[PDB]
Structure formats: structure tokens, C-alpha cells
Amino acid sequence: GIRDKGVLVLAASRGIGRAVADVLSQEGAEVTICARNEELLKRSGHRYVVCDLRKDLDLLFEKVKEVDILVLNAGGPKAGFFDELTNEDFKEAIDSLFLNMIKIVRNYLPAMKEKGWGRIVAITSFSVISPIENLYTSNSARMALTGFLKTLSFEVAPYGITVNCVAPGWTETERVKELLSEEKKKQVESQIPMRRMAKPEEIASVVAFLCSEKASYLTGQTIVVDGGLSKFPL
Amino acid sequence: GIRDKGVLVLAASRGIGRAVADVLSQEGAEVTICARNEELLKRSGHRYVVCDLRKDLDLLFEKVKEVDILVLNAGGPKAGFFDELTNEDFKEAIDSLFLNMIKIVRNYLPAMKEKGWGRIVAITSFSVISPIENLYTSNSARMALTGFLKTLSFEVAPYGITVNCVAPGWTETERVKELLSEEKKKQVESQIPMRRMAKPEEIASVVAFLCSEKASYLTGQTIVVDGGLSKFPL
Amino acid sequence: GIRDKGVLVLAASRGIGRAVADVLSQEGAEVTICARNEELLKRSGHRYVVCDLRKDLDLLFEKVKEVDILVLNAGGPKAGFFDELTNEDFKEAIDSLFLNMIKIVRNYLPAMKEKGWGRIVAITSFSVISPIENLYTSNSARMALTGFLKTLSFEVAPYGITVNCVAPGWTETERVKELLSEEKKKQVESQIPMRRMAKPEEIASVVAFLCSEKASYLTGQTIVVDGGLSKFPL
Amino acid sequence: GIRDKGVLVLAASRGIGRAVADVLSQEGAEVTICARNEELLKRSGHRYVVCDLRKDLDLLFEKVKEVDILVLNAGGPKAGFFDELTNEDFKEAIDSLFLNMIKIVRNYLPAMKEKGWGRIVAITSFSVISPIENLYTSNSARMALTGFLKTLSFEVAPYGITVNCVAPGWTETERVKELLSEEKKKQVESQIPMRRMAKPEEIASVVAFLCSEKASYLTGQTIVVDGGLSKFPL
């Protein structure tokens, strides 16, 4: 039940974030998205803020004041094996996937406490429980955030705020339909039990559910939505 | 989207299984429940079969022929420390919570393959990831079923059938409001971050979601719905 | 420090169980092994008892009275897709890999409590956290025993008894060098980061360490020994 | 078998790090320890470097050139609930427990590859799988490092290098015998199944084992050494 709730979705001009904004809009929430590309944002049909999170967080906090539902999401950082990654690559990933996210929570959390209701949902990756061999930066940075949000979930629970992650597997975002060949996309598709990648709305729907009033007893969890790919049984 | 899908819910005259039946009925599914007590079943307002998961299941298969959605559920076996449990206690738990469930899946799975759609959802316990010290029989039997359903999820994924568990924490079922004093209830309730037990419908709605067309890319997963109690971070 | 401790190792005429028996013997423990094949046992150079892990229980308890260290181990049950496995397959695996093990523990446990010192070690499989797709019977039965032992580990901890599993990955036992071609062997080997299967002693040495006095604060854990194969981060 | 291997242990003038250096010295390794406190280090009887690792990595790499075995370890960061922690608290923890650690590995890893043998062991905490409610900064930073090392273990495995964490539970270090009252110590002690905290050597021996030639097929693992405290069963 999310008619009239305030929603912010980060990195939401395209891909999963976009799909999440779309759903929540169709279920009557008042949604703001934010991203780097203004042109993409004007075309989205949503309320938007142009927001490079490294440089200018106070612009975001000024233009989007309070928020019942917060979906954390980011671009994926550099892939590579250990010798082709610098200290700067790990630092940038930590800043943008972990420390900047903490700042954003810290900002919007007090109004949720005051209302006695809230939702935080972080979009991470199934690579969190089934680490991919060349994603050193995002593996470790998403484990970081996932730990932070678990510890958080304990403290905010009594205020009616849930805190969860959704860990999508391979998703057919326009970004992925460019980072990969047809040969590589087939090979990967063939190791997914469902023998396909997710439509972005298939990830969106899980996130929309955790945001609804029906998910009120579910917190401190990472829901993996990956077609059956990861092997971990519990 | 589950108007007109055939649904069977086990151990569903009371508690969580009852709530699950109620929801899916409200969303337009054709629901049959089954349990031991016929008088409870007559009063439930649902299609029913009298059935016992410690014994023969043939009556069940005859009276309920095909099924799009199958929710596995049972009564909780005996609690106890090791010296106050017999080999029989372990065997009865294994038969009822594991082997008889495999036989039920075996039975309704073929018609799901034939249609290219299906859903299997097992209601287990948060004790599976956060084992309670005197639940030796249910801990180990629920691990067994979880292990079985994960292995299964791999195989049936390409047929459009998902396989998941919902692992509820402390829930205010009539059964629990009788297993426990007031003193023990408050002690428990004070260790749950949400500071309360779940209404049965709070577990129901998660199950109901996994059963919908929206959960199409989510399989092989145990969703813990426990108010934040279990500490495991992934 | 295990000079003169009494040891029983199951399924130990060949493979990993044999390697465990040999180590513990070299470190001065008085070791009994047990298995079906009497001529293999005669030739092993160890104290032995002939036993099935189905019928022959109280012969074992008769000929092997008390034991400081108990290594549980069994043959691997039938591998297969769901439609090529019977109710009897699941039932035999649960009896031999789970309920018979509970019986053996129940037997040898009282004398460990009496002495204030004990060691139980179950050899299971890395398939426990990274389930292989057609090992339905072993996956679920090993999860069952792993769950049992974890719950157990809580209760026997104060009595100076540790309870742990060792989960070996692909090991070069002569059984495996027969279950597999050269082509299948290489395919598998090339997905192990160490690019090879374990010598049986490389699993044995882990088991031997859990059995030593030095492992005195480590209980309720499954050590995975798999050359890096399983993806699970925690 | 580690007679003559070169060993470096960080944060090792006291506590667990100290205990690890002691053992490995007794087994014939040539050990250097490093910490901030020079006077403690002189008194240790070991080879030592003094270093605030924010600013003396150049010193450390200079005075300790190559190393077969690398035990990563750090002081514990600030404990607190979310409102009493700043962005600098999170930053400092990430720096010191994660990004500095990567820099050290990056340094000592090439000579391990060149020799075809090595060991990296991080001492983390059982709070990684059983997160404590007010350790936001260490929980999330240790998850980061654990995720980093697991991703690394895949790549370095073919080179004869293992990568593991040891996650001690409550240990009777002098530092802990000061952070806690008697009253709080006993409450804690009474929730550990073993009913006591670890002697630092009891965590040291697990580390020493991972460092030996006998742990050759064991990598990509976090061994939890916690007297049975954490409930996670797998």
C-alpha cells in the first residue's frame, strides 16, 4: 500500500533503477529519480534531479527534502584482475558504493523515524554470495554496504523501518547488452538454470514488494533474484 | 497474476497455512487445503481434503488431481534436548517433513512441466539459518528439505517452475499462543528487533508474492521473514 | 596431542577415511576402522571391524566399546535427475547418511562426557554449500546431518567435546578415478582454481587437526577443503 | 612444515597477533612483527618494525623485503550506534582494515607467485557472520576485506598460494580484559556454549595450521573459532 509515499531512486535514468521508478509510479507513489545524464532524465517522464554524488550531495538533499522509501543503486565499477586494478579503483568503488550511500541514509533516516514507517532497499548483486572472479571492486564494496545495512536493520527495526537488499543476477539492461558479445551472452545464458537473463521489471517487482506495506515483517535480508544461478542453499 | 490457478496448501486449517489459503483465495485462485481435523476444515470456508502427512497420501492425489501452485507446510515436531529424544522422533520428523513432501512434489510436478509454468513454496523456519537449541528434529529435517528443493530448483527452472522456501520467525499463530506463557512470550518478543511476533498474514503475503507471475526470476531461495532476529548477514 | 586416544573411523578401508586412519595412527592414536570389505580391511594393517551402515550396528558397539574421537564417513549415494530416483533412493540415503550416524553418536557420546573431552568429525561434501545438480540424495542427507551436528555442538560444548564437519571437494580417491573418464576429469580439474583434485591426505590433515588438542575452541563449523571451488564468501 | 619460511604479522605486539608470531617462531619460521608501540616491540623478543601504516608502508616494505607467509591483522575500530558514528569513523575503518591491507598484499604477492608457494591469512572476527549490533564500522570493513580475499583466492590458487580468514570469537586479550567489566564479561561468557573466552593461543594454533604445508588444499575460507557462539549452520 504505497499510494502517495515519497520515493527516491538513485541511478535511475536507465536499467533496473529506471524500472523500479516506473513500477512505484504506476502504484501511485510520488517518485523522484536521479542520475548524471540530464537529457535521459528529461525524457524519462519522472521528477528528476541531476546529481553527481561525488561532487554535490547537498543539491540532492535540498531538492528532495523527505522520503518514505529510498532505493540505493549505482553504476557498476571497473572489472579486472588484481594486476590491472589500482588503489584508486578500490577507493572510488568504496566511496561511491559504500560511503556516499551511508551519507544518503543518514540524511533521510530521521524523517522516517519521526513518521514511524520507512523503507530502505539497496540494489546490489548476486555476485555478493557468488563472487565473480574479476569483480574485486564491487564484490568487496557491496559486502561492505550489505554489512552496514544488516547492522542498521537491527537499530531501525522498532521504528517501523525495514532495511533490505535485492541482489539481481544477470539482467538484460541496455548497459549489459553492450558490455557483452552475443557469444558471451549465450555462454552465460546457458549456465543460468532459467536459461535467460532477467527483464529489468523482474527485479523491479521484488524491490516494489519490499517497499509495500505487506513486507512489514521482512528486514535485514538480501533477496537474490538470479534465475537459480547461485549455488548457496540457505 | 493468479486468478484461476489451481492451488494446494498443506497443514492449512489453522495458522500460516490457513492465512496463505485465505490470501490466494482473495486473489482469485482455486484453493484446496488439507489437514487432519475435518471439523476445522468444514468451518474454514475452503475446498478441503482430510489428509495426514505422517501416513498415506493417495486420497490426496485422487481428490486433488493437478495443481499450478503447491505450498508445502507441516506441523512442528517434538522439541527437546538430545537425551529426551528417541530415534523414533528423528524418523517421524524425517518422514513427515522430508520424505512425504518429496512424494507430493513428485506427484504434482509433471503437470506443471506440461503447462510450462509452476510454483513450489515450502514453509520452513528461521531456525534453519539460526538454529534454536532444542529443535534437533525440525532443524535437521528442514535442512534436508531445503537441500532437496535447492537441488530441484536447478532442474525445473527451464520449465517455468520456481522453487523457494519462506522461513518465518516467531508468528502469532493460535498454536504458539498456547505453547507459551506470557513471561516466555515477552522475553522472546524483546529479542526481536521489531519487538513483536508476525501476524500470520505477514508471512502469507510473502508466500503469495512468490506464487505470483511477478516472482518469475526468483528461484532456489529461502526468504527469511523474521522481524530482523537472525544475525546472518547474507 | 593425541597419543593414546581411542579413535573410530567409518568407511575407512579406502579413500579419505583410510587416509584419516593412517594419519591418526602415525600420531600415536589407537585406531579402529570399519567397512564392508573384510579382505581390504585385513590388508589395511589396522585394527578393524566389518560393518554395513544399514544392518550391523550392535556388532560395532560390541567390538569397539569406547572412543575419544569419532570420524563419521560413508559411501556416496546414487547420483541422478529427479525422475530417475525413487523414494527408496532418498530413504536409503537418509538412513545411512543421517539416522544411522545419529545412532552411532548417541552410543559413543556418554563416555566422552564422562571424560570431559571429545571429538566428533563428519566428512561430508563441499556440495553442502555448493550443491551439484544431480546429487539430490546426498545434498539433502548431508544437510540433514550438518544441521543435526550444529544443534548438537551447542549442547556438548561445555563438556569439552567439539563437533565439526570437513567438506572435501574433488578428491583423487581410487573410487573417483573410476567414476570418471579422463575427459570428465580434466573438465572438472580446469574449474578448480588450484587446477587439481586433492590427494586424500590433504583432507585427512584437516580432519587430524580438528581431532587434536589444538582445535579446542573450534566447534559447530564445516571446514570446506576444495581448492577454492565453492563461491560462497563467508 | 614451515622451518625457515619468512613471516610477517601485523598488529602483533600484543593479543592474537602476538600469539601467532610466538607459535610460528617456535616452529622455526623467521618472523617479523609490526606495530605502533616500540617499547612493547623491543620487549617482545622478536624481529620488529615500528609503523603507523597510514604513513609507513614505505618503511615496512623497505625493512621487510619478501615474505612467504603474511598474517593481516589490525586494531579494532570505534564501536557505536549509528548516531554516534561519523563519516570519518567509517572512512578510517575502511582505510585501515581494507584499503591498506590490499596495498600490503599487492606488495608481498609477486615474490610468492615467483616461488610457487605462499600463505595469506587475515584475522577478522566472528562478527562477520554473526554481526554485533554496535560494530557498524568493523562489520562492514571486515566484510569488504573478506570479499576481497575470496575474490583473490581464485586467482592466486594455481600459484600455490592459499588465502584464508580466521574469525575469532571472544578472546581473552589484555585489550578485552580492559574494555569490559566483570559483570559484562560473565554475561558474555554465559552465552558462549564453551562457557569461556579463547586463550589467544587457541586462535593462534588455527592460524598456524593454515600457514603449514598441510593446509595445501584449503583456500577461500573463513574459519570461525568462537567456542560455538555463532548460529550459522553451514
PDB file of N, CA and C in Angstrom, chain A residues 9-22 40 73 123 171-177 199-201 203-204:
ATOM      1  N   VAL A   9      14.817   7.226  -6.038  1.00  0.00           N
ATOM      2  CA  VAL A   9      15.567   6.108  -6.618  1.00  0.00           C
ATOM      3  C   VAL A   9      16.820   6.674  -7.240  1.00  0.00           C
ATOM      4  N   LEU A  10      17.978   6.141  -6.815  1.00  0.00           N
ATOM      5  CA  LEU A  10      19.280   6.579  -7.338  1.00  0.00           C
ATOM      6  C   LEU A  10      19.673   5.783  -8.586  1.00  0.00           C
ATOM      7  N   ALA A  11      20.515   6.397  -9.433  1.00  0.00           N
ATOM      8  CA  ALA A  11      20.982   5.850 -10.725  1.00  0.00           C
ATOM      9  C   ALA A  11      19.841   5.218 -11.486  1.00  0.00           C
ATOM     10  N   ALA A  12      18.812   6.024 -11.721  1.00  0.00           N
ATOM     11  CA  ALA A  12      17.512   5.513 -12.198  1.00  0.00           C
ATOM     12  C   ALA A  12      17.025   6.067 -13.513  1.00  0.00           C
ATOM     13  N   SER A  13      17.928   6.530 -14.367  1.00  0.00           N
ATOM     14  CA  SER A  13      17.552   7.017 -15.697  1.00  0.00           C
ATOM     15  C   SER A  13      17.390   5.832 -16.655  1.00  0.00           C
ATOM     16  N   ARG A  14      18.183   4.794 -16.393  1.00  0.00           N
ATOM     17  CA  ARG A  14      18.171   3.570 -17.176  1.00  0.00           C
ATOM     18  C   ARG A  14      18.251   2.343 -16.268  1.00  0.00           C
ATOM     19  N   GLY A  15      18.047   1.186 -16.880  1.00  0.00           N
ATOM     20  CA  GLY A  15      18.227  -0.082 -16.236  1.00  0.00           C
ATOM     21  C   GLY A  15      17.230  -0.380 -15.141  1.00  0.00           C
ATOM     22  N   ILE A  16      17.714  -1.125 -14.156  1.00  0.00           N
ATOM     23  CA  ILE A  16      16.902  -1.597 -13.026  1.00  0.00           C
ATOM     24  C   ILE A  16      16.296  -0.441 -12.238  1.00  0.00           C
ATOM     25  N   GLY A  17      17.112   0.574 -11.971  1.00  0.00           N
ATOM     26  CA  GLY A  17      16.636   1.715 -11.212  1.00  0.00           C
ATOM     27  C   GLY A  17      15.471   2.359 -11.921  1.00  0.00           C
ATOM     28  N   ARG A  18      15.567   2.444 -13.241  1.00  0.00           N
ATOM     29  CA  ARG A  18      14.508   3.011 -14.024  1.00  0.00           C
ATOM     30  C   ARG A  18      13.237   2.188 -13.884  1.00  0.00           C
ATOM     31  N   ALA A  19      13.388   0.884 -13.988  1.00  0.00           N
ATOM     32  CA  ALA A  19      12.262   0.015 -13.928  1.00  0.00           C
ATOM     33  C   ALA A  19      11.605   0.140 -12.567  1.00  0.00           C
ATOM     34  N   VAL A  20      12.398   0.279 -11.504  1.00  0.00           N
ATOM     35  CA  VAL A  20      11.836   0.438 -10.134  1.00  0.00           C
ATOM     36  C   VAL A  20      11.031   1.740  -9.983  1.00  0.00           C
ATOM     37  N   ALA A  21      11.546   2.808 -10.546  1.00  0.00           N
ATOM     38  CA  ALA A  21      10.841   4.066 -10.555  1.00  0.00           C
ATOM     39  C   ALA A  21       9.510   3.944 -11.283  1.00  0.00           C
ATOM     40  N   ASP A  22       9.530   3.263 -12.425  1.00  0.00           N
ATOM     41  CA  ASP A  22       8.322   3.078 -13.225  1.00  0.00           C
ATOM     42  C   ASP A  22       7.229   2.364 -12.485  1.00  0.00           C
ATOM     43  N   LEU A  40      18.594  12.200 -20.674  1.00  0.00           N
ATOM     44  CA  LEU A  40      17.905  10.962 -20.351  1.00  0.00           C
ATOM     45  C   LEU A  40      16.834  11.198 -19.295  1.00  0.00           C
ATOM     46  N   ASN A  73      21.181   2.630  -5.346  1.00  0.00           N
ATOM     47  CA  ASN A  73      21.540   1.982  -6.588  1.00  0.00           C
ATOM     48  C   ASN A  73      22.687   2.766  -7.162  1.00  0.00           C
ATOM     49  N   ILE A 123      19.981  -1.984  -4.067  1.00  0.00           N
ATOM     50  CA  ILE A 123      20.212  -2.897  -5.164  1.00  0.00           C
ATOM     51  C   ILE A 123      21.700  -3.236  -5.208  1.00  0.00           C
ATOM     52  N   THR A 171      20.965  -9.363 -15.705  1.00  0.00           N
ATOM     53  CA  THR A 171      19.800  -8.656 -16.145  1.00  0.00           C
ATOM     54  C   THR A 171      20.034  -8.023 -17.500  1.00  0.00           C
ATOM     55  N   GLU A 172      19.039  -8.119 -18.379  1.00  0.00           N
ATOM     56  CA  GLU A 172      19.105  -7.536 -19.734  1.00  0.00           C
ATOM     57  C   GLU A 172      18.885  -6.028 -19.727  1.00  0.00           C
ATOM     58  N   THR A 173      19.793  -5.295 -19.093  1.00  0.00           N
ATOM     59  CA  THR A 173      19.812  -3.841 -19.201  1.00  0.00           C
ATOM     60  C   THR A 173      20.559  -3.478 -20.471  1.00  0.00           C
ATOM     61  N   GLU A 174      20.196  -2.332 -21.042  1.00  0.00           N
ATOM     62  CA  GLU A 174      20.894  -1.811 -22.222  1.00  0.00           C
ATOM     63  C   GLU A 174      22.418  -1.720 -21.987  1.00  0.00           C
ATOM     64  N   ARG A 175      22.833  -1.439 -20.758  1.00  0.00           N
ATOM     65  CA  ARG A 175      24.260  -1.454 -20.418  1.00  0.00           C
ATOM     66  C   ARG A 175      24.907  -2.822 -20.606  1.00  0.00           C
ATOM     67  N   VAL A 176      24.182  -3.879 -20.277  1.00  0.00           N
ATOM     68  CA  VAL A 176      24.735  -5.237 -20.354  1.00  0.00           C
ATOM     69  C   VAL A 176      24.699  -5.712 -21.793  1.00  0.00           C
ATOM     70  N   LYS A 177      23.613  -5.382 -22.507  1.00  0.00           N
ATOM     71  CA  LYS A 177      23.509  -5.640 -23.962  1.00  0.00           C
ATOM     72  C   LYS A 177      24.522  -4.823 -24.779  1.00  0.00           C
ATOM     73  N   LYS A 199      14.332  -9.728 -17.343  1.00  0.00           N
ATOM     74  CA  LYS A 199      13.851  -8.392 -17.801  1.00  0.00           C
ATOM     75  C   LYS A 199      14.042  -7.504 -16.589  1.00  0.00           C
ATOM     76  N   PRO A 200      14.447  -6.248 -16.746  1.00  0.00           N
ATOM     77  CA  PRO A 200      14.579  -5.391 -15.592  1.00  0.00           C
ATOM     78  C   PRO A 200      13.332  -5.322 -14.686  1.00  0.00           C
ATOM     79  N   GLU A 201      12.125  -5.361 -15.253  1.00  0.00           N
ATOM     80  CA  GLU A 201      10.913  -5.346 -14.419  1.00  0.00           C
ATOM     81  C   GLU A 201      10.831  -6.561 -13.471  1.00  0.00           C
ATOM     82  N   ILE A 203      13.211  -7.690 -11.664  1.00  0.00           N
ATOM     83  CA  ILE A 203      13.995  -7.272 -10.491  1.00  0.00           C
ATOM     84  C   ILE A 203      13.250  -6.172  -9.749  1.00  0.00           C
ATOM     85  N   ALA A 204      12.800  -5.211 -10.529  1.00  0.00           N
ATOM     86  CA  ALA A 204      11.897  -4.164 -10.071  1.00  0.00           C
ATOM     87  C   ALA A 204      10.771  -4.724  -9.196  1.00  0.00           C
TER      88      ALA A 204
END
